[PDB]
Design a protein around this motif. Structure first.
Motif, PDB file in Angstrom:
ATOM      1  N   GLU A 129       6.097   8.832   5.047  1.00 38.41           N
ATOM      2  CA  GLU A 129       6.102   8.627   6.488  1.00 38.41           C
ATOM      3  C   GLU A 129       7.521   8.793   6.983  1.00 38.41           C
ATOM      4  OE1 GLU A 129       3.681   4.954   7.170  1.00 38.41           O
ATOM      5  OE2 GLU A 129       2.320   6.573   7.778  1.00 38.41           O
TER       6      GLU A 129
ATOM      7  N   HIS B 121       4.847   0.805   0.800  1.00 41.48           N
ATOM      8  CA  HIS B 121       5.210  -0.243   1.819  1.00 41.48           C
ATOM      9  C   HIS B 121       4.827  -1.587   1.275  1.00 41.48           C
ATOM     10  CE1 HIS B 121       4.943   2.992   5.192  1.00 41.48           C
ATOM     11  NE2 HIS B 121       6.098   2.974   4.538  1.00 41.48           N
TER      12      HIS B 121
ATOM     13  N   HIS C  86       1.280   5.556   1.258  1.00 38.74           N
ATOM     14  CA  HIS C  86       0.852   6.749   2.016  1.00 38.74           C
ATOM     15  C   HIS C  86       1.230   7.941   1.155  1.00 38.74           C
ATOM     16  CE1 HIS C  86       0.695   4.281   5.772  1.00 38.74           C
ATOM     17  NE2 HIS C  86       1.592   3.585   5.088  1.00 38.74           N
TER      18      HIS C  86
ATOM     19  N   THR D  33       2.935   1.548  11.208  1.00 35.59           N
ATOM     20  CA  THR D  33       2.700   3.006  11.289  1.00 35.59           C
ATOM     21  C   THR D  33       1.227   3.365  11.429  1.00 35.59           C
ATOM     22  OG1 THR D  33       2.566   3.376   8.912  1.00 35.59           O
ATOM     23  CG2 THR D  33       4.805   3.445   9.921  1.00 35.59           C
TER      24      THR D  33
ATOM     25  N   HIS E  66       0.887  -1.207   0.000  1.00 33.87           N
ATOM     26  CA  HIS E  66       0.000   0.000   0.000  1.00 33.87           C
ATOM     27  C   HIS E  66       0.901   1.226   0.000  1.00 33.87           C
ATOM     28  CE1 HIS E  66       1.086  -0.799   4.205  1.00 33.87           C
ATOM     29  NE2 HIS E  66       1.151   0.547   4.270  1.00 33.87           N
TER      30      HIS E  66
HETATM   31 ZN   LIG Z   1       2.295   1.700   5.444  1.00 31.21          ZN
END
Ligand SMILES: [Zn+2]
Ligand SMILES: NS(=O)(=O)c1ccc(C(=O)NCC(F)(F)C(F)(F)C(F)(F)F)cc1
Length: 258
Positions: free
Chosen positions: A104, A117, A94, A196, A92
């Motif tokens: 992140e 990720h 962010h 996270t 996925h």
């Molecule tokens: Zn992630």
């Protein structure tokens, strides 16, 4: 309602239901490139994705996950800082509302437009739910995205997002090759950390690639048309679904490269 990335339920609130948010090995972190020490003892990573079987893509209200068949050792991560074999379960991203934030991890305090990720679990614990309870249960490969030239191997992902606009929608997503999301170099930083997102379990070996991939403005604009909300609910664009850097505490970030 429950946790999210709005003003009232975002990262600064998560500690109330998940006190580990203030723990000793939280992620993400800033990677200070001058302080990370080259470790000539680290191995080259082994990313073995030739037999990867993607199945489905799911908007879960916080991001979208591209899910793989992890019932056997198809797509695996080995080597680097890792002992043993880690099976790919999902990837996925962010991302931000604009190009100047979204990642992140940060590098010398720089935020990238997004961060991918690739999530893997240690097979020595038998299933994913057991692996997240162990300090060496997961390995997450983190790849930064910057905006420039399009990434050809990302387009299949971008073109299905219109069909999973809202939370709880899924679509078939077979035959996607995650090797097309990798950069050229596999040089990396590594440190021990956490998930996270809640429940923020301290179960992850992080492996963050130094070389970002380039994606186009149009590609990331399409991530930003997704919704956090469910169908027919007031529209909340899925943007800024990143947790800020957490205190490094008593941890060392090691570099695989000089
Ligand atoms: Zn992630
Ligand atoms: N963003 S990240 O760090 O790559 C990342 C990667 C994976 C998860 C994740 O599987 N959460 C879901 C979960 F594991 F916590 C769970 F609910 F399934 C359970 F029950 F604990 F096992 C969260 C964050």
């Amino acid at each position: 309602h429950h946790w999210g990335y709005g003003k009232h339920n975002g990262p600064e609130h998560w500690h109330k239901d998940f006190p580990i948010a203030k723990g000793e090995r939280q992620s993400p972190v800033d990677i200070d490139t001058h302080t990370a020490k080259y470790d000539p003892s680290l191995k080259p990573l082994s990313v073995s994705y030739d037999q990867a079987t993607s199945l489905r893509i799911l908007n879960n209200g916080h991001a979208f996950n591209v899910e793989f068949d992890d019932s056997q050792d198809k797509a695996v991560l080995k080597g680097g800082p890792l002992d043993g074999t880690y099976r790919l379960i999902q990837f996925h991203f962010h991302w931000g509302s604009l190009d100047g934030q979204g990642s992140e991890h940060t590098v010398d305090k720089k935020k990238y437009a997004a961060e991918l990720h690739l999530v893997h679990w240690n097979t020595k614990y038998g299933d994913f739910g057991k692996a997240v309870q162990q300090p060496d249960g997961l390995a997450v490969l983190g790849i930064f995205l910057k905006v420039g030239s399009a990434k050809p191997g990302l387009q299949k992902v971008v073109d299905v997002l219109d069909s999973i606009k809202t939370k709880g929608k899924s679509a078939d997503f077979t035959n996607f090759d995650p090797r097309g999301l990798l950069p050229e170099s596999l040089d990396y930083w590594t440190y021990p950390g956490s998930l996270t997102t809640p429940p923020l379990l301290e179960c992850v070996t992080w492996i963050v690639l130094k070389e970002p991939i380039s994606v186009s403005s149009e590609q990331v604009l399409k991530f930003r048309k997704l919704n956090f909300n469910g169908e027919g609910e007031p529209e909340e664009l899925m943007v800024d679904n990143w947790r800020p850097a957490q205190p490094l505490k008593n941890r060392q970030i090691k570099a695989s490269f000089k």
